[PDB]
Amino acid sequence: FQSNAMKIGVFDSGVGGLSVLKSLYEARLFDEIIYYGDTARVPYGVKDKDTIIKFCLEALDFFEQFQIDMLIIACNTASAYALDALRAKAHFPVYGVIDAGVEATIKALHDKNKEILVIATKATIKSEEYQKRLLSQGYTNINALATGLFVPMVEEGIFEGDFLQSAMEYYFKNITTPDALILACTHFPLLGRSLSKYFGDKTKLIHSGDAIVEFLKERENIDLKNHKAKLHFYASSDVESLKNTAKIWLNL
């Protein structure tokens, strides 16, 4: 089977990038998407920079046999550090989650003095990348906060209830209700309904998936497809467990 259109690949460390994969799939911008997840070596925030890079390079070598038009890095950690040596080795546009999220935040605020909150893993925060960027463009009212416990709550299917509420109430103790909240972790889009309901209408949720859909439109020549795209899933370890949560998060 060969047709004349665009085939791309999505790479996250674990299963978080499935939420990103969701938004891309609903868009119908491609005909085939290749999801790979290095689930053997999860998570990536633990390692130093050089090892993440040598790890991300091993994923590129993987994507070569498929020969894709564009590669998307769904890991905020990999996006921070590895999104460069990939380009010094790729023959095709390789993009990441951070800028799309930042740009989508700015466009949605257009107001330098508005209140921005950005939640993520401990590793995503320490890199300061989202911060280093939003400041450069003159946005002043910003705080960044590590809410790492949301990740295993997502993986155990906790999306609602007093327990999740107790978690939000815990993490968000004496916190300014922001105008826009950024989800700098790929698991977090699974808790959005609870968070907005918790934060209220004032807070505008910046979806990493939705931020990159609008992002690629700005940067690339894209056609909307009549037919829905074809999914492929690949994992370092335990592929079928990924395929499950894939069906769960999306309902194919």
Swiss-Prot record:
BP-aspect Gene Ontology terms: cell wall organization; peptidoglycan biosynthetic process; regulation of cell shape
A molecular function (GO) term: glutamate racemase activity
Sequence positions that bind substrate: 12-13, 44-45, 76-77, 186-187
Keywords assigned by UniProt, alphabetized: Cell shape, Cell wall biogenesis/degradation, Isomerase, Peptidoglycan synthesis
Pathway this chain belongs to: Cell wall biogenesis; peptidoglycan biosynthesis
Residue positions of the active site: 75 (proton donor/acceptor), 185 (proton donor/acceptor)
EC number: 5.1.1.3
Reactions it catalyzes: L-glutamate = D-glutamate
Enzymatic class: isomerase
Function in brief: Provides the (R)-glutamate required for cell wall biosynthesis.
Family: Belongs to the aspartate/glutamate racemases family.
Protein name: Glutamate racemase
Source species of the chain: Campylobacter jejuni subsp. jejuni serotype O:2 (strain ATCC 700819 / NCTC 11168)
